[PDB]
Design a protein around this ligand. Sequence first.
Ligand SMILES: *[C@@H]1O[C@H](CO)[C@@H](O[C@@H]2O[C@H](CO)[C@@H](O[C@@H]3O[C@H](CO)[C@@H](O)[C@H](O)[C@@H]3O)[C@H](O)[C@H]2NC(C)=O)[C@H](O)[C@H]1NC(C)=O
Ligand SMILES: *[C@@H]1O[C@H](CO)[C@@H](O[C@@H]2O[C@H](CO)[C@@H](O[C@@H]3O[C@H](CO)[C@@H](O)[C@H](O)[C@@H]3O)[C@H](O)[C@H]2NC(C)=O)[C@H](O)[C@H]1NC(C)=O
Ligand SMILES: *[C@@H]1O[C@H](CO)[C@@H](O[C@@H]2O[C@H](CO)[C@@H](O[C@@H]3O[C@H](CO)[C@@H](O)[C@H](O)[C@@H]3O)[C@H](O)[C@H]2NC(C)=O)[C@H](O)[C@H]1NC(C)=O
Ligand code: NAG
Ligand code: NAG
Ligand code: NAG
Ligand code: NAG
Ligand code: NAG
Lengths: 167, 167, 167, 316, 316, 316
Amino acid sequence: AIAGFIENGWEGLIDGWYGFRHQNAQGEGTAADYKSTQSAIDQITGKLNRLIEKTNQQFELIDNEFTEVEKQIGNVINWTRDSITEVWSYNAELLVAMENQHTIDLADSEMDKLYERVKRQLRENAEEDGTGCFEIFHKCDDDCMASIRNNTYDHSKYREEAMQNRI
Amino acid sequence: AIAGFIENGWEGLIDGWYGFRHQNAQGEGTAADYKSTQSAIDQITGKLNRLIEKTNQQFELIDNEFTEVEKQIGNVINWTRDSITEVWSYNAELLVAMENQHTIDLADSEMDKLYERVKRQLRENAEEDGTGCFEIFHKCDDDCMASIRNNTYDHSKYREEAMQNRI
Amino acid sequence: AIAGFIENGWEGLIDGWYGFRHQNAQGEGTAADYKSTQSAIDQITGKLNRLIEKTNQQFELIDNEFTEVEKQIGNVINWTRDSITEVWSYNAELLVAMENQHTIDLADSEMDKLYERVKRQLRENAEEDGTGCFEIFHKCDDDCMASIRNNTYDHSKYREEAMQNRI
Amino acid sequence: GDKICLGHHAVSNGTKVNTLTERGVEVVNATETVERTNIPRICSKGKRTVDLGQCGLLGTITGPPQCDQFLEFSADLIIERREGSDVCYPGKFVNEEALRQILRESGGIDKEAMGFTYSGIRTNGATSSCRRSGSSFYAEMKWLLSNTDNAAFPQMTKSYKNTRKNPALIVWGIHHSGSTAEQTKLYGSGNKLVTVGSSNYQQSFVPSPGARTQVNGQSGRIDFHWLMLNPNDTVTFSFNGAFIAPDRASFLRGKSMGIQSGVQVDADCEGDCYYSGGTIISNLPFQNIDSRAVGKCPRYVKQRSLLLATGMKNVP
Amino acid sequence: GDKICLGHHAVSNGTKVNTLTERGVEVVNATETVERTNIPRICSKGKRTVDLGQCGLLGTITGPPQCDQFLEFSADLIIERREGSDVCYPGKFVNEEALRQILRESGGIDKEAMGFTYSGIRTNGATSSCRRSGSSFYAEMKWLLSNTDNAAFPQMTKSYKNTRKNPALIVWGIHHSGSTAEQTKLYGSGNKLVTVGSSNYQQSFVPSPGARTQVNGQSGRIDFHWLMLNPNDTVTFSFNGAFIAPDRASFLRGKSMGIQSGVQVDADCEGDCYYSGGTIISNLPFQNIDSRAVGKCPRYVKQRSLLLATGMKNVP
Amino acid sequence: GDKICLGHHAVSNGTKVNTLTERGVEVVNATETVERTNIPRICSKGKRTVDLGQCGLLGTITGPPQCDQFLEFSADLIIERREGSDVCYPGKFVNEEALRQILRESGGIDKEAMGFTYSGIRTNGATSSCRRSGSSFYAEMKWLLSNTDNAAFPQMTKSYKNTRKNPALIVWGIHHSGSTAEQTKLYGSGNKLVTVGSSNYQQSFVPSPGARTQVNGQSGRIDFHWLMLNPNDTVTFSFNGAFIAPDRASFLRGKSMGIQSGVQVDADCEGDCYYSGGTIISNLPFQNIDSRAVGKCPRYVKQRSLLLATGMKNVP
Ligand SMILES: *[C@@H]1O[C@H](CO)[C@@H](O[C@@H]2O[C@H](CO)[C@@H](O[C@@H]3O[C@H](CO)[C@@H](O)[C@H](O)[C@@H]3O)[C@H](O)[C@H]2NC(C)=O)[C@H](O)[C@H]1NC(C)=O
Ligand SMILES: *[C@@H]1O[C@H](CO)[C@@H](O[C@@H]2O[C@H](CO)[C@@H](O[C@@H]3O[C@H](CO)[C@@H](O)[C@H](O)[C@@H]3O)[C@H](O)[C@H]2NC(C)=O)[C@H](O)[C@H]1NC(C)=O
Ligand SMILES: *[C@@H]1O[C@H](CO)[C@@H](O[C@@H]2O[C@H](CO)[C@@H](O[C@@H]3O[C@H](CO)[C@@H](O)[C@H](O)[C@@H]3O)[C@H](O)[C@H]2NC(C)=O)[C@H](O)[C@H]1NC(C)=O
Ligand SMILES: *[C@@H]1O[C@H](CO)[C@@H](O)[C@H](O)[C@H]1NC(C)=O
Ligand SMILES: *[C@@H]1O[C@H](CO)[C@@H](O)[C@H](O)[C@H]1NC(C)=O
Ligand SMILES: *[C@@H]1O[C@H](CO)[C@@H](O)[C@H](O)[C@H]1NC(C)=O
Ligand SMILES: *[C@@H]1O[C@H](CO)[C@@H](O)[C@H](O)[C@H]1NC(C)=O
Ligand SMILES: *[C@@H]1O[C@H](CO)[C@@H](O)[C@H](O)[C@H]1NC(C)=O
């Protein structure tokens, strides 16, 4: 028996981030979905480009390792630098925390968008099973499974039959 | 032929951010929805009030353009100021990036909330077409379209008829 | 008469954050849902652990209250410190604002997740009323209400009957 | 079949902005967040304003000719200019910039006589470098010479108590003569010392006579020094020549701000953030105009522009 | 019809907080993030604590009477007080604050004799300003006079090697007499120089005798100077009068922190962030009590309060 | 029943990261954000590089023997080393570190003769501490003695105009002799003054002769001083002994950066962020290697690691 994202992930989905697992008479099968995969990858790549920036500002020695500067000014410099380090350390921590939350949520959201898309192209010809799958109330051969995947499935073709098996 | 938000936006919707396009025998029509529009506007206006704040802290010259201060203290001041500029530049960039993501998402979410509201007032009398519209399985004249818009549509009134046309 | 989260909250729900109100012949009742409650609490507790951190960096006096330091260096110190205060004040304000938005949204999202879960276990045996409730199209005694709450409700058991009352 | 669609607005000309995830996503509307706009004038409305012009700020305390109008000036906003000079006879202040920073936020100054009087010396030291109607000197100071050329200079002590409730700004000078011959012509032979103590402060001064570069006809220099004298404290000046003595102490009036600038005042516009090029009037949180801007200012940032979205994604 | 509703909790008395989008949205619960609460005492549990009271920190090195208990003090936490004075005979340290900053984190000090001895001068310079049982002087120093009044002062050199492994703190003094007459009465006629060189350090000193304001009966002043002498290095003191010589060098013990405060110690409460008004005990990330607080502290912020939501939106 | 399921990928052995809400949630993938990786060499490709080795940076201006190769050096990147010394005859620069900071970003230096000539004195002051082929001196300076032992030293003035368009770096020295006897053997009896004025700058100098610790055979010291002389301005030197005179002024070439380091150059690798231990080549925004790193650098942070998620939640 087969299950979807509401239960868990698919360690066996290897050529995509998001995908389809189907079950029919011809057997069982798994295919990746390219657009939703690439959409999540583009978005993450967007973050990387933003956070891999290299600063253009130059800084020079204000201090000396070999011959220590006068104590007063050296303490003021050390306090200034330490305060700045606090700031960057806090920022770095927050940024990563915040972005990770956002990366996680974004990826969920993309799965969500794919599932609610499929739900809609199946119209009245299927029902939600609650694990992230649809029970299709008609025979769906390999070609019919492929038409759902590439978004060409026409629900009216299978309607009268499906509507009936749901009653 | 008529489509909704899942496809694209409406360059012709001019008196609102969110709206309704209907199609019936009396013809075609578009009206803006006030509450969802105003809810998004209020929220954005909230951000503006937050980010248009004027600082109350005063700063004075520490440095001199006309007669340069001693080099050591001048370099320390310049390094301190440059470090601060880095910080503000990073903060400004992040803030805008973060808020824009949030503004975009917030606006989607408000469209989402309106659509799922309508779906629920139509109950069993309509179906999702997948472009952001509903196929209503009964005759809906101009007044009936207006009752959906102002949230007075009573689904039981049209049920027995609608239920039948979808079977 | 009984309503859900789309209208408002339940001042009377006291032993949980999220819950169920049911109405049947045996009467009216309210029970808290533990997992969704605890999930929101764990998440908030996560934030607290992150923002209650105690800094490990030590700072010392750079300045003197009793005998003022030379003016030039004292002004530089004061400007440095004031600039740092701006930064921390802005960060603190932003953090709280940002986290509060996130806390609010997170809690909504958990309610959402519970409602869409229930919707799915009820399958074709109920309908959305639009206030956050389900009209169940069959007799659901106290035990049947308990089976929905603890996620053991089997929709096929009640299907033929429910499907019929919806027609 | 009758249908109802839900939608949102859009336009052909989207504005591009950045997000966490994407560069240049188009939105329906956006507003700038970084100020680049500048008013090329000092907006002084609602503020007493002193434009020091030819007069150097520190000069208001010593009083070379350029500063005659400003010996007791009073202000909320103080403007220094490039051409300002603190001196007439060549020289400089020790700790000059600290003292400038004090005067810039001082509200101006009020002058009290310290009441020194003198016996068996001259008092009318003068020079063509400081000219009013012909040769003259720093208005607030007295150039003490020996009674006649070469003549000996009586050793002297003179003191002054600050009987006010605020600290008093005290200033004096050491004259460094162009030669040893000129130092003797003025204060006589012998070496020369000048010692200055309050209680809070002890310091000492020897003149260095010697040839220097001729500045405004002058080979000599005057070192100016200063201190804050606390309420009820006394300052005492012991000395035997080469001393440029204060006639008046200064007291700070209230609060002010000072700027350095190259543009006109304008009392008709109002403002609170200034820089050398004008005033920055803006509610934006950030600015990319000048990092040294002062007042109550948007925060200076490196970037020209950071657009903030004020509408949804544009999907036309 | 049987029905099941989903809901969430709510209360009548919501707490208002701010978000990215809204000011004062009500939530079910919230907690403060900015500390305003202060313990009006120094919480010293677990720390060796020295309350210097009458004794100025720098005075522990020179040893005026007020500092007798503290000549070799030892501490984790050092508390300075407003009434503390570093002196008995009037005077001040040059570079004072740097030296304070060194002593505050020093752990205290341990004193070694430098072993100077003297021929054909006196050693018992004394004054009514430094009194133990009648007239006396700085405990760690020797006021060297000439043998007899007006008498001449043998030129001298004296040196000391730091044979320990840490740097040694060395201190000396220049006596600036109330007149030239007093300077000769004490060290005889002639001018007077004092020269001090390690290897790492070269500097020089002339006394400035002259009248000053009378500070505790005294018109004279003592300039105190200092250096760090590196391990194995020698300091050498060449001089012919007006020299206040060290008897003992100081060495820093370990690590400490110093504060300035106006409130009692309390060994029963524990703490790590201090300020002049007490100790700040708090796990909050921010505080609005004192910007100059020291130790391990929440970050100082401008705002009184920033509430952080700890529950959902309140919809009653 | 035929069915179609939607899913997402997963792996055994997720990577743990932190979020706003949870510590150590597993994701499918993640990347480091804090650089810890260091190249233990100075990556100089594309940059003219001077390794000063034995030569102290300030020594390039005065020219002790160690610095002979570098008297007119030219560079984009300047490397100082621990063993570098600025001197041969013991002494130090006043304002040394400011001057270092100037030379580090100077691009190197170009030397012009100031054209001083001399009558009735000697010019060949020398010492075993500065040795080339036997006794010698600072290459860029002239140790002026009196014409013969004990002999008197003609009082002198000498000046130099900066006729270039950039400011000129001027340097001179005060000789502090091991005794008064040696001061007189060299410059004769009498006291000794050295006065130095441009227009922009007035200051003065007395030698302090006296015994100090012997540093490479020497009990004497040379104080070095400096100024920037503006375009068209003149500096003038009045003096009567104990003067170590400049032969050449220096001018800054262009732009450079200087570092302090203990590792080899490598012209084959390229870099822009340096520290004492090597070069940090990295596109990461942050680093945990050295807080004093210089160049164009990732921002220094306290944490060893902060992983950033680059995939979804792992649910295996
Ligand atoms: C696109 O966005 C801009 C910026 O958000 C919109 O302009 C803004 O419209 C508001 C609405 O009133 C203006 O508010 C004003 O605030 C000032 C502040 O003192 C007040 O004096 C005014 O009476 C008013 O309340 C806001 O300032 C204005 N900002 C700018 C920079 O123009 C604009 O309307 C939007 N465009 C479209 C097509 O929606
Ligand atoms: C409303 O929110 C506040 C703050 O979030 C709730 O109080 C907090 O409750 C937690 C849960 O136990 C407390 O944890 C405790 O921490 C201490 C300190 O180390 C520890 O010793 C205890 O064993 C426990 O782990 C937390 O301290 C406490 N915070 C405060 C400031 O009171 C509060 O209960 C909430 N109100 C409602 C009605 O839920
Ligand atoms: C898990 O995440 C890491 C880090 O995000 C993935 O590696 C990254 O993959 C991208 C995609 O190509 C690399 O881009 C490269 O840029 C360089 C230099 O600018 C270019 O020369 C390359 O040809 C390429 O375009 C990126 O550098 C790389 N980052 C790292 C640190 O390796 C990784 O592939 C992911 N792993 C899995 C199993 O998905
Ligand atoms: C400044 O910091 C470094 C390490 O950050 C330390 O070795 C040094 O002694 C500190 N300087 C002073 C003057 O305390
Ligand atoms: C400080 O910065 C300004 C530009 O901000 C520059 O012109 C000036 O020379 C700098 N000062 C020093 C000492 O480098
Ligand atoms: C520095 O700050 C304090 C308050 O933070 C103020 O009382 C003090 O006088 C300031 N010092 C100067 C020199 O402005
Ligand atoms: C300062 O004033 C008080 C009384 O106003 C007086 O007793 C005290 O002696 C005064 N001190 C001096 C040095 O004048
Ligand atoms: C420092 O002392 C050691 C004895 O441990 C001695 O060998 C050495 O000569 C001394 N240092 C110098 C520079 O002479």
